[PDB]
């Protein structure tokens, strides 16, 4: 007599027989949290694959639901999305699960890449937007319990190996949940050491100088060559194309072509904007090399951001802007290992700095951007 399963672009929800809505929550992982491999290997051998993790489970989850808590589970599961775990067997295991806990339980599955896949809030936002009868939660009064937490190595015996990821602790952090491991919630062991990512989403924003020295140009009255250099996905194109491509300065993008083109416009009386990654000083040395042949200055915009922030950036507008062209982490880590700072020995006349800065957001979509969005 369950209300069951529904299914949603990029969700799956299941709410049991005895749900009820609460404005507190105790929320769960599902693997490596309420439960493990009964094989003993790292990953499941098959859908039957599984154990309650600790005994003293079903006991603390019998505690919160005579307490009042509303029991949840948020689960990534993007083998699915993949279309490597069939849904419908994911939602048998689940059931399965379910029974042998023996506790109502609601249940939402991240099946994709995205807005619901931990850290994102996207999960909290439905249960309490859309799955809870619009009983406000309070966030302080509940608790999310996970095992992708950032521990270290070693946090215990036969722990050789550190979190895969920390991707539960941060969608806590992001939702503003306390928050706890399975074994120091359930058995009460000391909190584990952990790390956090070294960019913080939380502290960007739309301060600061556009660019740097504030007492330099953007533009130019005459020609010449402006080489942006930084992280594809930094949001180098959007500023180019808002403050230099606007201002009347030509295009140029070498992978869609180079320099007898920026040659060209020179002659043409124009100025040119070399809208690529550039990473190193081969790559430059064709632009710059041009730009002295012409007699006209070089100059180089170089942006800042570093590469966790041109991914984050990159997830938030794969999130947000149906236009977003995905930058692949295979070209993220190539233009790294590339990567040679700007400097006037190559020939620039001078170097801008574009400080990565939060763009001119709608309120909630700031909010979106504040997130941590990966493990
Ligand atoms: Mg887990």
């Known amino acids: 007599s369950s209300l069951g399963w529904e299914s949603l672009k990029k969700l799956l929800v299941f709410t049991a027989s005895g749900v009820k809505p609460q404005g507190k929550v105790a929320a769960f992982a599902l693997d490596g949290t309420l439960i493990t491999t009964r094989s003993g290997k790292v990953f499941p051998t098959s859908p039957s694959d599984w154990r309650i993790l600790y005994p003293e489970i079903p006991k603390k989850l019998q505690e919160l639901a005579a307490e009042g808590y509303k029991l949840v589970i948020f689960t990534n599961q993007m083998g699915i999305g993949r279309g490597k775990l069939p849904a419908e067997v994911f939602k048998g295991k689940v059931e399965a699960v379910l029974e042998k806990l023996g506790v109502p339980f609601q249940v939402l599955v991240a099946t994709h890449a995205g807005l619901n896949r931990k850290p994102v809030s996207g999960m909290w936002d439905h249960l309490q937007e859309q799955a809870n009868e619009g009983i406000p939660i309070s966030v302080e009064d509940s608790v999310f319990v996970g095992d992708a937490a950032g521990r270290l190595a070693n946090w215990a015996p036969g722990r050789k190996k550190k979190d895969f990821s920390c991707a539960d602790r941060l969608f806590a952090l992001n939702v503003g949940l306390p928050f706890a491991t399975p074994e120091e919630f359930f058995l009460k062991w000391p909190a584990a050491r952990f790390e956090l990512p070294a960019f913080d989403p939380r502290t960007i924003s739309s301060a600061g100088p556009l660019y740097l020295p504030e007492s330099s140009s953007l533009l130019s009255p005459n020609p010449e060559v402006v080489v942006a250099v930084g992280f594809p996905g930094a949001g180098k194109s959007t500023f180019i194309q808002e403050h230099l491509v606007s201002a009347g300065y030509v295009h140029v993008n070498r992978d869609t072509l180079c320099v007898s083109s920026c040659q060209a416009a020179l002659r043409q009386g124009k100025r040119v904007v070399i809208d690529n990654t550039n990473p190193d000083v081969p790559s430059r040395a064709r632009y710059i090399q ?69 763009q001119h957001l709608d309120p909630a979509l700031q ?4 997130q941590f969005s990966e493990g």
């Open 290 to 358: 041009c730009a002295k042949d012409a007699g006209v200055p070089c100059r180089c915009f170089n942006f800042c951001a570093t590469i966790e922030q041109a991914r984050h950036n990159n997830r938030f507008r794969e999130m947000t802007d149906p236009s977003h062209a995905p930058v692949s982490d295979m070209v993220m880590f190539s233009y790294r290992k590339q990567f040679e700072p700007p400097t006037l020995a190559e020939g620039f006349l001078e170097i801008l700095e574009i400080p990565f800065r939060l």
């Open 367 to 370: 909010r979106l951007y504040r």
